[PDB]
Ligand binder design. Structure first.
Ligand SMILES: *[C@@H]1O[C@H](CO)[C@@H](O[C@@H]2O[C@H](CO)[C@@H](O[C@@H]3O[C@H](CO)[C@@H](O)[C@H](O)[C@@H]3O)[C@H](O)[C@H]2NC(C)=O)[C@H](O)[C@H]1NC(C)=O
Ligand SMILES: *[C@@H]1O[C@H](CO)[C@@H](O[C@@H]2O[C@H](CO)[C@@H](O[C@@H]3O[C@H](CO)[C@@H](O)[C@H](O)[C@@H]3O)[C@H](O)[C@H]2NC(C)=O)[C@H](O)[C@H]1NC(C)=O
Ligand SMILES: *[C@@H]1O[C@H](CO)[C@@H](O[C@@H]2O[C@H](CO)[C@@H](O[C@@H]3O[C@H](CO)[C@@H](O)[C@H](O)[C@@H]3O)[C@H](O)[C@H]2NC(C)=O)[C@H](O)[C@H]1NC(C)=O
Ligand SMILES: *[C@@H]1O[C@H](CO)[C@@H](O[C@@H]2O[C@H](CO)[C@@H](O[C@@H]3O[C@H](CO)[C@@H](O)[C@H](O)[C@@H]3O)[C@H](O)[C@H]2NC(C)=O)[C@H](O)[C@H]1NC(C)=O
Ligand SMILES: *[C@@H]1O[C@H](CO)[C@@H](O[C@@H]2O[C@H](CO)[C@@H](O[C@@H]3O[C@H](CO)[C@@H](O)[C@H](O)[C@@H]3O)[C@H](O)[C@H]2NC(C)=O)[C@H](O)[C@H]1NC(C)=O
Ligand SMILES: *[C@@H]1O[C@H](CO)[C@@H](O)[C@H](O)[C@H]1NC(C)=O
Ligand SMILES: *[C@@H]1O[C@H](CO)[C@@H](O)[C@H](O)[C@H]1NC(C)=O
Ligand SMILES: *[C@@H]1O[C@H](CO)[C@@H](O)[C@H](O)[C@H]1NC(C)=O
Ligand SMILES: *[C@@H]1O[C@H](CO)[C@@H](O)[C@H](O)[C@H]1NC(C)=O
Ligand SMILES: *[C@@H]1O[C@H](CO)[C@@H](O)[C@H](O)[C@H]1NC(C)=O
Lengths: 66, 411, 98, 49, 49, 48
């Protein structure tokens, strides 16, 4: 439900709106299905739809030196 | 037979500002037209597919604004992060890199974020990327651009010392590498100082960000106009549906609601038409910005006045609301001397020509120099090539070209 | 009937000044007037430093400078003839006006 | 193992033409719709912005 | 409704003239103020000026 | 009858030398190599 607060309707309030049926996750990944405001969802581990904050790929500290 | 050659240059940090994406906006066209009036909502069925088509059009714009934003910024596979030690040979990026004390925006991205600036079915959707994720991408692009040059565009990023990367950008404008390392102190000071002046240019006045503020203003103007149009009478007895529904019998209330449906729908069509056209402009600006990312940031363009007004060295992106700012680092010449010149020079009855550069003298003894920074060298068989008999070249002049093998008369 | 046309900001005389300036830069100074400061350079030498920019060595220009000049001037002649001979060239501009 | 290498060239001046501006146009929307009729001018206001 | 249609036609046309003007400005910046190495951007051939 | 190097846009045949050519690797790996006699511009000077 875009823009609403979940009171007004598992459940997870997001910056994009009230999301229902998706499990929140604290890991992060490439965006599989986009939702909004950095949130993305995937079908994942017995398996269910999860939702997570997008990772913009993996980080890399480039081994720069003078 | 006269040439002016620059003896000196300035680095410059010409700024360029491009919009990249409108506010993602959608209208429940039935709530806009009818405000939950069941009589109105039913009359709107008689008009058929327009309401569905307008939402398809606005949704096309809305998805496309994330795409536009993704095409500009997502030009990298990995989020590169800068080393802890800022050993960049004097170049002081501390204004353009993330300030971690906060959202990991840089200092200059904060100036840009500071300087910029109902619900009748009207809704604004959030962007897919948060402005913090955009600041991660502009940090990645920048951290690659600092640590690894163009190479992070061409697949795998490779470390290289920043002064060496600059020498291999100087060579990309025909200025020989030694004209960087022999001036490294002075080039560092010029670049650092120029970055300094950008902060004043952005802090002093709002008029620099005019392009982005026009896009914000035009959307707010169009939305305010679209909402005000609901109060427009369109030849009804009133612009409030409850008046019509209470004051009139159903057949007359319907004919009056039809005037309002017509006026409101014609307004909504007008608005969506403006937004499709405006979004086409923003798409063209985003594809341009995406290209300046791909050429100037991820590369070094040899397109004159594409990557800012000078000989181009490199560029840095900085995120801004609905837009992007490029800091195009450009070489520009700045002091020059007149010299007498000749297309070729003649020696031992044959024409000689410079391999690279131009021939010059200040009216006395002949020197070759590269053609973007005066660096007179003794003319030799090795900085030159022969091209047959002396005669046919218009305006050739004489010299004794030096033979570097001449001292070697031992065997 | 309530329709109006406004004049362009730049007069056609100012447009002809700009095209003359652009051209006078292009002639006297190569690319240099785009890259900030316009520097004189002799035109034969500028053309050698445009042949060198298409992988053709400078000597091929100076050893042919008269032949090249004649082909260039002759081609400019064919422009005046071609443009005088037919309106079909300026199709785009007349189409925009129409 | 065969290559063709040019022994000679031509300069060739090719024309290109591009439009740059439409004719700057403006319409008095009220004078166009209503032709100075005061009775019309008052009805046009109902259509709003 | 004819006026809205006319303004719409002119907007869409003005966007084509803008696209053509940016291209003209780019040919000014590369073909006049420089030497574009973009094959068949500045006329059909290797490009001088 | 004669092998020459030339610039690739205008036939300007030059005698092949250490100066207009660079060496790489060994004779065996290149599919298309031919024989030749590359001239050494120091050889007439070594005759001194
Ligand atoms: C090429 O242009 C640059 C920039 O115009 C010249 O660089 C430096 O310019 C300053 C004045 O703008 C020179 O003055 C001195 O600056 C120091 C502080 O850095 C100050 O303590 C002194 O009292 C004085 O004002 C500075 O000497 C000069 N740098 C160098 C390397 O001499 C540069 O000189 C120009 N190069 C040529 C060959 O024209
Ligand atoms: C004009 O241009 C010429 C050549 O393009 C410059 O040539 C200068 O020539 C002299 C003698 O060959 C070089 O040696 C030095 O000369 C001075 C003055 O005679 C003397 O005090 C020194 O002991 C030394 O012999 C000089 O290095 C060379 N200059 C350069 C820049 O390489 C000439 O300087 C230019 N200026 C004038 C007014 O001639
Ligand atoms: C560049 O240097 C060369 C060599 O010093 C100059 O060429 C020489 O120029 C003189 C005239 O200034 C020639 O003398 C004349 O030769 C003709 C031959 O038909 C004769 O009929 C005349 O009575 C007179 O003697 C001289 O032969 C010539 N030498 C060579 C080896 O070419 C040249 O003038 C200098 N300047 C320029 C800009 O080329
Ligand atoms: C490369 O092509 C050009 C022509 O495109 C050759 O140069 C010469 O061009 C002129 C003018 O088009 C030709 O016409 C005339 O020839 C008569 C004599 O037959 C002469 O009296 C006229 O004054 C006029 O110049 C001329 O025939 C042509 N020359 C030749 C030998 O074809 C140029 O030679 C070509 N380059 C090479 C290396 O073949
Ligand atoms: C370019 O010329 C060279 C030198 O002639 C060719 O390389 C090899 O030359 C020798 C003598 O002419 C050929 O004879 C054979 O030599 C081997 C020892 O290397 C020996 O075991 C045999 O009994 C016989 O004497 C040799 O066949 C030839 N190499 C090859 C692969 O045929 C070279 O072939 C010439 N380049 C090309 C592209 O053919
Ligand atoms: C959601 O609505 C409830 C209503 O009781 C309110 O307490 C809560 O603060 C709201 N939360 C958000 C994130 O809007
Ligand atoms: C995610 O993190 C929050 C805050 O640290 C924590 O309360 C929550 O239990 C975590 N949930 C999961 C599924 O790890
Ligand atoms: C070059 O010399 C001429 C001599 O008349 C002078 O007008 C011009 O200003 C000089 N240019 C420079 C850059 O010194
Ligand atoms: C111009 O320069 C040429 C050599 O390039 C010289 O021979 C000629 O005398 C000069 N022009 C005039 C009109 O004197
Ligand atoms: C082509 O040239 C190569 C040169 O080594 C030769 O081996 C090959 O047999 C030739 N093939 C044909 C089809 O001419």
């Amino acid at each position: 439900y875009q823009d609403v607060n979940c009171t007004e309707v598992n459940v997870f309030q997001t910056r994009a709106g009230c999301l229902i049926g998706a499990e929140h996750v604290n890991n992060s990944y490439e965006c599989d299905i986009p939702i909004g405001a950095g949130i993305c969802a995937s079908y994942q581990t017995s398996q269910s739809i999860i939702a997570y904050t997008m990772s913009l790929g993996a980080e890399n500290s480039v081994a720069y030196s003078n | 037979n006269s040439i002016a050659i620059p003896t000196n240059f300035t680095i410059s940090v010409t700024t360029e500002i491009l919009p990249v994406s409108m506010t993602k906006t959608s209208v429940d066209c039935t709530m806009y037209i009818c405000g939950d009036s069941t009589e109105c909502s039913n009359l709107l069925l008689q008009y058929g597919s327009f309401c569905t088509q307008l939402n398809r059009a606005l949704t096309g714009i809305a998805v496309e604004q994330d795409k536009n934003t993704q095409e500009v910024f997502a030009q990298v596979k990995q989020i590169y992060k800068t080393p802890p030690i800022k050993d960049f040979g004097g170049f002081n990026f501390s204004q353009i890199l993330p300030d971690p004390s906060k959202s990991k925006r840089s200092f200059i991205e904060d100036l840009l974020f500071n300087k910029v600036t109902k619900f009748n079915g009207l809704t604004v959707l959030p962007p897919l990327l948060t402005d913090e994720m955009i600041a991660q991408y502009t940090s990645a692009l920048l951290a690659g651009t600092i640590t690894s040059g163009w190479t992070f565009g061409a697949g795998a990023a490779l470390q290289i010392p920043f002064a060496m990367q600059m020498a291999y950008r100087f060579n990309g404008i025909g200025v020989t590498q030694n004209v960087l390392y022999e001036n490294q102190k002075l080039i560092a000071n010029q670049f650092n100082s120029a970055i300094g002046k950008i902060q004043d240019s952005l802090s002093s006045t709002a008029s620099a960000l005019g392009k982005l503020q026009d896009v914000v203003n035009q959307n707010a103007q169009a939305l305010n106009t679209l909402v005000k149009q609901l109060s427009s009478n369109f030849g009804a007895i009133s612009s409030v549906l409850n008046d019509i529904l209470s004051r009139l019998d159903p057949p007359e209330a319907e004919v009056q609601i039809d005037r309002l449906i017509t006026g409101r729908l014609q307004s909504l069509q007008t608005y969506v038409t403006q937004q499709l056209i405006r979004a086409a402009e923003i798409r063209a600006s985003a594809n341009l910005a995406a290209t300046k990312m791909s050429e100037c940031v991820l590369g070094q363009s040899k397109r004159v006045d594409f990557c800012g007004k000078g000989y181009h060295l490199m560029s840095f992106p900085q995120s801004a609301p609905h837009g992007v700012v490029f800091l195009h680092v450009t070489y520009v010449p700045a002091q020059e001397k007149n010299f007498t010149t000749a297309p070729a020079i003649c020696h031992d009855g044959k024409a000689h020509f410079p391999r690279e550069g131009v021939f010059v003298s200040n009216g006395t003894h002949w020197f070759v120099t590269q053609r973007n920074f005066y660096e007179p060298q003794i003319i030799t068989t090795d900085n030159t090539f022969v091209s047959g008999n002396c005669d046919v070249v218009i305006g050739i002049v004489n010299n004794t070209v030096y033979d570097p093998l001449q001292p070697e008369l031992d065997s």
